[PDB]
Amino acid sequence: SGFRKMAFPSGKVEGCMVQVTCGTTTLNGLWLDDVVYCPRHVICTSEDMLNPNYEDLLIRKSNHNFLVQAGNVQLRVIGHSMQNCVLKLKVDTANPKTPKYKFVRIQPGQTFSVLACYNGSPSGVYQCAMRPNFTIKGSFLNGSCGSVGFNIDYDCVSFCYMHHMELPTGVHAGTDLEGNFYGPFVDRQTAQAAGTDTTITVNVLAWLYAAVINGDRWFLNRFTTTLNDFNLVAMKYNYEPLTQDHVDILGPLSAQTGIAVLDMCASLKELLQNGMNGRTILGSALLEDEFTPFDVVRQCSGVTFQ
Amino acid sequence: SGFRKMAFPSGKVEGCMVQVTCGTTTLNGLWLDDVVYCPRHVICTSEDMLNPNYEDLLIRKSNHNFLVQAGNVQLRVIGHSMQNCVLKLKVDTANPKTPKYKFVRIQPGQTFSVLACYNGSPSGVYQCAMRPNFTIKGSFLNGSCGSVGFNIDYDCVSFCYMHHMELPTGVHAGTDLEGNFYGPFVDRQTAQAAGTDTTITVNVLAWLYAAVINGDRWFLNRFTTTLNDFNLVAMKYNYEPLTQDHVDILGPLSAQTGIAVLDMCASLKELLQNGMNGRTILGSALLEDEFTPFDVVRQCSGVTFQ
Numbered sequence: 001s002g003f004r005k006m007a008f009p010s011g012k013v014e015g016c017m018v019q020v021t022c023g024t025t026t027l028n029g030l031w032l033d034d035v036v037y038c039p040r041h042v043i044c045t046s047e048d049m050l051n052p053n054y055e056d057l058l059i060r061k062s063n064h065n066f067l068v069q070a071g072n073v074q075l076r077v078i079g080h081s082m083q084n085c086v087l088k089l090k091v092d093t094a095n096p097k098t099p100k101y102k103f104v105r106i107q108p109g110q111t112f113s114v115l116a117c118y119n120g121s122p123s124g125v126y127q128c129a130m131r132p133n134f135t136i137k138g139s140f141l142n143g144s145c146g147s148v149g150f151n152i153d154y155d156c157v158s159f160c161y162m163h164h165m166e167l168p169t170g171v172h173a174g175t176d177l178e179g180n181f182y183g184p185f186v187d188r189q190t191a192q193a194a195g196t197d198t199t200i201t202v203n204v205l206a207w208l209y210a211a212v213i214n215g216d217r218w219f220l221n222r223f224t225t226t227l228n229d230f231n232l233v234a235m236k237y238n239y240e241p242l243t244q245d246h247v248d249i250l251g252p253l254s255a256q257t258g259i260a261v262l263d264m265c266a267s268l269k270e271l272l273q274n275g276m277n278g279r280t281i282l283g284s285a286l287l288e289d290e291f292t293p294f295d296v297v298r299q300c301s302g303v304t305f306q
Numbered sequence: 307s308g309f310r311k312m313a314f315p316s317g318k319v320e321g322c323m324v325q326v327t328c329g330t331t332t333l334n335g336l337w338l339d340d341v342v343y344c345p346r347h348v349i350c351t352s353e354d355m356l357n358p359n360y361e362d363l364l365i366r367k368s369n370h371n372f373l374v375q376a377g378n379v380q381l382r383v384i385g386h387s388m389q390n391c392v393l394k395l396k397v398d399t400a401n402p403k404t405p406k407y408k409f410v411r412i413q414p415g416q417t418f419s420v421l422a423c424y425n426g427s428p429s430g431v432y433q434c435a436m437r438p439n440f441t442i443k444g445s446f447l448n449g450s451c452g453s454v455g456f457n458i459d460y461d462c463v464s465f466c467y468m469h470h471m472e473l474p475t476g477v478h479a480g481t482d483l484e485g486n487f488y489g490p491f492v493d494r495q496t497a498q499a500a501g502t503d504t505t506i507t508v509n510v511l512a513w514l515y516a517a518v519i520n521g522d523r524w525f526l527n528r529f530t531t532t533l534n535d536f537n538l539v540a541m542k543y544n545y546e547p548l549t550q551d552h553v554d555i556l557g558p559l560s561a562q563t564g565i566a567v568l569d570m571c572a573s574l575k576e577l578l579q580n581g582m583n584g585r586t587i588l589g590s591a592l593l594e595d596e597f598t599p600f601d602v603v604r605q606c607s608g609v610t611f612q
């Protein structure tokens with residue numbers, strides 16, 4: 001028993017991290033087969049960040065302007081191209097530690113692990129969620145650009161996030177591995193702010209099920225509600241509306257605890273209207289929304305990986 | 307910026323995890339050079355857990371009673387011995403992925419990363435603290451025994467914890483890698499309970515500094531206090547007393563924020579007496595005590611590793 005913010009083991013990703021330098025700027029790259037992926041703003045100078053024209057900036061570069069280092073070994077850049085907001089650097093050597101992988105775009109509310117890196121060197125691993133406003137509440141210092149986010153499906157690493165920038169509110173924005181931004185953000189220094197965030201309701205419900213599995217039961221009650229009555233209360237408190245698909249996703253947790261979803265919704269409705277009154281749930285005094293139903297099952301039933 | 311529960315990258319440890327089977331019982335082992343380390347209760351049956359005599363149980367075993375598997379490869383056990391509560395299995399093959407390592411015993415209040423494993427296969431990584439009552443609030447299911455806890459110092463893995471059991475309150479107990487239990491616990495099924503836990507004060511202060519670094523300032527005030535006046539209030543609320551050594555450890559964070567330790571203590575004293583009144587600090591509505599001063603510096607300044 002117990003419940004922790006649990007990340008995926010990072011070994012398979014650590015062996016893909018490299019350092020990429022172009023001019024004065026150094027950041028992190030992802031080396032898979034014979035391609036290194038990194039944020040395209042590695043080719044910008046201080047004067048260019050304001051209003052960069054990436055097509056011009058790239059045509060003025062040649063392969064030898066790009067220093068790629070994998071630990072001590074230097075990688076020779078054979079070619080380069082731009083795919084949306086990512087630079088693809090073809091190198092002479094394929095990474096022998098390339099895992100089975102795929103590139104997937106995740107949806108708001110889904111979680112992944114982040115391997116925070118500096119100078120091509122892994123520093124720490126942590127779990128976070130893609131927020132409904134398409135930012136992540138990460139922990140990143142200068143030099144962390146090109147750090148990646150990922151999930152593991154059995155033997156396969158699904159890369160879903162590459163870090164590009166920090167917004168003025170301290171939250172973080174990036175792209176999928178095809179270079180397409182999550183959210184309405186651009187890789188130029190402008191006056192872009194995140195829109196209004198909401199609480200991920202299906203995740204809060206999954207976490208309440210985790211609590212029940214771990215012996216926290218004080219918030220339960222005998223009532224039941226309907227989807228529409230709950231959603232009426234949810235909207236008032238800036239909670240995402242709940243759908244039938246969400247109810248279905250929660251099925252396995254309903255089954256294991258014998259507590260119907262709509263039953264759990266009535267507890268949630270009560271917590272939203274009265275608060276928690278100095279009581280905690282799984283060691284928290286706030287409702288936690290960064291565990292998916294799948295995270296809970298995995299941690300409260302025990303799936304491993306390659 | 308940002309602040310997360312950050313674990314160490316686990317790659318160097320993942321390559322040391324093996325599966326150990328003896329009879330009906332399978333758990334995890336740590337394979338370093340030509341030795342596999344695992345909990346000695348792997349040699350117990352159901353009848354033995356009540357009152358095991360490990361000397362007798364071990365003399366009745368031979369090397370071939372021990373099945374050690376590293377992925378698909380089977381490891382041949384050449385010898386075996388007991389060191390306190392750990393079994394040391396000598397195998398015919400030295401682990402080529404053995405990192406630079408050492409065995410260290412940690413103190414209450416220190417943090418480490420846990421690589422939770424099942425059947426020799428890494429499942430997840432998370433950060434926790436050794437509590438003042440010598441338990442950890444982990445997340446472990448059946449089969450997790452032999453999972454290890456570790457820190458990374460530059461290139462070197464410091465192993466500090468091996469998981470042995472879950473106590474009736476849902477918290478977890480184990481040994482250092484020399485087989486000596488943390489706390490007054492024994493590896494037999496008896497009526498052992500954890501003693502009273504306290505809050506790790508120096509860690510709460512470090513976390514308040516992290517908050518200030520990240521722009522949460524609402525709890526600060528102009529007052530200062532003395533060590534003895536603070537400790538008088540701390541005792542009332544089940545907080546560990548604060549020493550001059552703690553003040554010294556917090557020095558770097560005092561320097562970076564310009565807020566003296568005793569100044570920060572007056573804020574803490576206020577938070578203990580009035581509460582937080584619906585305000586949060588770094589996204590928490592409770593005072594967090596599982597980040598050391600070193601954790602904060604590392605995350606708010608950015609140290610990497612091999």
Ligand SMILES: O=C(c1cc(=O)[nH]c(=O)[nH]1)N1CCN(c2ccc(Cl)cc2)CC1
Nearest residue numbers: 041049140141142143144165166187188
């Ligand atoms: O390393 C960080 C960084 C990342 C982070 O998440 N937090 C933080 O403090 N620093 N940089 C800030 C964003 N930079 C940038 C943005 C746009 C363009 Cl066009 C060019 C450069 C690169 C450097």
Ligand SMILES: O=C(c1cc(=O)[nH]c(=O)[nH]1)N1CCN(c2ccc(Cl)cc2)CC1
Nearest residue numbers: 347355446447448449450471472493494
């Ligand atoms: O895998 C777990 C386990 C670990 C955990 O942390 N949480 C959980 O639910 N299960 N076992 C419970 C403790 N067992 C045991 C204890 C003492 C002796 Cl002498 C022999 C066996 C081994 C099996």
